[PDB]
Symmetry: D2
Subunit: 152 residues, 4 copies
């Protein structure tokens, strides 16, 4: 009954990949990091790593994903291209919490060049720990997102 | 003419006139097309994200501006439309880089999270900042297209 | 009873009732003491920073909340009062750390920069989060006091 | 006719002290970084380094100061304790620009643990490049801060 969390980065965020692994563990003993990012700081293409994590989330191999690039923007765009994925670019505690409470987000995206590591830590912990509210209006809106996916 | 479709849900309705103004402030060539709600009544963000995103995807407008409480819902829903690159921005840097690196065509903002003067800065910066056209960025954007195609 | 003096200038007057509410939301023991403008007309932030800062310095209230356009003016002016440790916060993390590390007694926020729900989070976090009391932080806080004394 | 910019940090921000020096230079050839922070990653007390930079600014030895700690908060508080200093904790381009335009700030404070380095870069460049507006209401308000100092 533990919860798997796939982690991916591109090259700038490779610098903090050990941080990301640690922060997932810090969210609780029930969270198991699955690192899927690169092994060097050599230039790579973020969509490749977004895709790897997003597909795992979509196939339900893991419950959550954590993605980091320079700004988080690339990861959030690429990951959301996978049906079943709800990837939330978060920059603080509030966005991290609300992404779960309102959007039942399954992937958190952060920017290594934009957000300091202790805020990234807080984002990851908050994202993982905060439950989805389950409230009627949110469920309806999430279903509407799914409908958009279905239509394409 | 560079058309900019604008969508909100209910919390961001109170600033929909702001959004129209900020788009215009980016330059005379930027033409706001308001596609959001007509009243303050509660609505569902994906409906308005979808409207704007489809317009961008269809090439009916060049850009979209989406606002909800946090910006998160707008960014998720809009990105579900093939051809859309929706960037949730919270400052000048993210606004600029979404264009320079990601060639983003939709900017998403949170009315409950980001103060209006920063939202103003975000919108203006997003609209005014060109895509770099750099080899690596073009390659990565095409990879995003490939993800869409694979699904 | 833990009293919290509140001050704003004109851009933040629009949310002064929010600020009062957010203080109360932190807990029944938190009592807001509104010391800001009674109207929306232009005022000078240092006048209201001074009023609240002096109350904190005097030990008349435990805490202060100051809001201006960016929070910057409030943070500069309030810190000019000996005994005041005014922290410009823009998120939950800065709100918490201002208390844990700096034992801050005034929180400053920007109405034009930070969305109201984040301002809410900042105020609640600031008031609820205790000072760590750690040796190194105490020492550093004392060095701030010494800077005041040397002037 | 060049413009001297004193730079101080405590220990968490020492890792980016070379960054800070570079970012000041990037603001323009007219800006001269004057590094005054620690020489090592050894734990230090931020008020000591805030004071050194703030005193340089107050005595007019330099025009501007750049201060970095974990959150920027400690630097902001300590530097503002020196009369003649207007130290602005900035977290983005907007606060960086407005601290100059409105507050004629002479010290910019940033958090190494909160703000990513490319945003710190933008903050420093924006802070240094953006002039004070000189507008009547701002001058009056700045004078009122000076009055507060004088009264103590
Ligand atoms: O959104 C994309 C992310 O920010 C990437 O990390 C960034 O574009 C890479 O930039 P560069 O290192 O290739 O210049
Ligand atoms: O991402 C979604 C955006 O934050 C919505 O505006 C929010 O969920 C609306 O919340 P509520 O007004 O229905 O509570
Ligand atoms: O730091 C000062 C705060 O941001 C003030 O609210 C701001 O300067 C007021 O600007 P204006 O309304 O007088 O233009
Ligand atoms: O405001 C003060 C700044 O955030 C300091 O860098 C921080 O308190 C240092 O904390 P520690 O490394 O001593 O735990």
């Amino acid at each position: 009954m533990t919860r798997r969390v796939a982690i991916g980065t591109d090259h700038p965020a490779f610098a903090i990949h050990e941080n990301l692994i640690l922060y997932v563990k810090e969210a609780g003993d029930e969270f198991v990091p699955v690192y899927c990012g690169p092994k060097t700081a050599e230039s790579v293409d973020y969509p490749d790593f977004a895709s790897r994590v997003a597909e795992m989330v979509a196939r339900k191999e893991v419950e959550f994903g954590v993605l980091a690039c320079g700004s988080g923007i690339g990861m959030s765009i690429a990951a959301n291209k996978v049906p079943g994925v709800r990837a939330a670019l978060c920059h603080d505690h509030y966005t991290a919490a609300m992404s779960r409470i309102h959007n039942d987000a399954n992937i958190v995206c952060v920017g290594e060049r934009t957000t300091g590591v202790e805020v990234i830590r807080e984002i990851i912990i908050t994202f993982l720990q905060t439950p989805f509210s389950g409230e009627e209006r949110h469920v309806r809106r999430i279903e509407k997102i799914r409908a958009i996916e279905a239509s394409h």
